[PDB]
């Protein structure tokens, strides 16, 4: 949860609270949506919790921070069961005027479109060729390339949606 | 939510418990996981709220079950915030043994290539040609291509996970 992804931050490096959030404004958006509010209220949690302590020279993380993050990484983490709130509405569709379903879908994909040329945009800039990058910058990588392919396949699946609704009618 | 997907069932015609279930196992259950008893508990309190009532001649929708699944209907429905366990679980490996977390994708992948089969088989069987389906039937299509798509989009992505997770090391 959001603070292993905190966690996993401080494990390479003590760093302070602009560092971490300057971290979810960047690489960690691509899979780890958090405001910096949330951020400090978590990090304030888990200074509590004995997680992470501070320094002067800066948050580090602790002995039971690393525990923590160890237990979690070990947790076997399965795919988030299924319920599909488009399919739900798509099913609807039978009984319900598809208008309005027809817009929010149009909608949403035009979003996905942006969304998708916004990543794509910067793994050219950054992450274009894994060979060169370090290994921290291949695992960044590879969350982008998360959002892509499955955002990809969403819009793919949402324009099959579209056409069906205008064959129908 | 839950008893939308069952007050969409009911929307087309009255059923007995034993006909909603049976859609839970089969087509709802391309887009919606529910086990019969969490049905027949929500069918309860669906009927103490007056959103379904009961008859001799089996369940019927009531008015306000059906002004409820237009409200339901009519709401914009919009994609879940984006916190991907697998990515936050990626990026640990710069700091973790990445030997727990590769066998978990692994297994996982296998998992997902036998419910991409699964689906591919259903579809050939029942759902090959939308041009010879009924309006129900293409819907049903639908929400099983919905699976089909993203699932196999993740597991393009674990594989390009798995290898990173060898040219690394």
């Excluded at 390479?12 to 979810?24: M, N, P, S, V």
């Excluded at 020279?57 to 599909?84: C, K, N």
Aim: some cysteine.
């Amino acid at each position: 949860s959001l603070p292993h992804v905190i966690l996993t931050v401080l494990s390479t490096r003590d760093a302070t609270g602009y560092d971490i959030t300057k971290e979810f404004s960047a690489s960690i958006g691509y899979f780890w949506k958090a405001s910096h509010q949330q951020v400090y209220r978590e990090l304030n949690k888990m200074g509590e919790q004995g997680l992470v302590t501070c320094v002067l020279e800066v948050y580090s993380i602790t002995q039971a921070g690393r525990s923590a993050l160890g237990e979690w990484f070990d947790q076997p983490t399965a795919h988030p069961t299924v319920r599909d709130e488009f399919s739900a509405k798509l099913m609807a569709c039978s009984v319900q005027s598809a208008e309005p379903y027809r817009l929010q879908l149009a909608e949403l994909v035009e979003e996905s479109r942006k969304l998708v040329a916004h990543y794509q945009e910067i793994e050219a800039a950054y992450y274009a060729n894994p060979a060169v990058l370090d290994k921290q910058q291949r695992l960044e990588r590879l969350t982008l390339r998360r959002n892509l392919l499955v955002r990809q396949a969403w819009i793919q699946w949402a324009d099959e949606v579209l056409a069906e609704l205008n064959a129908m009618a």
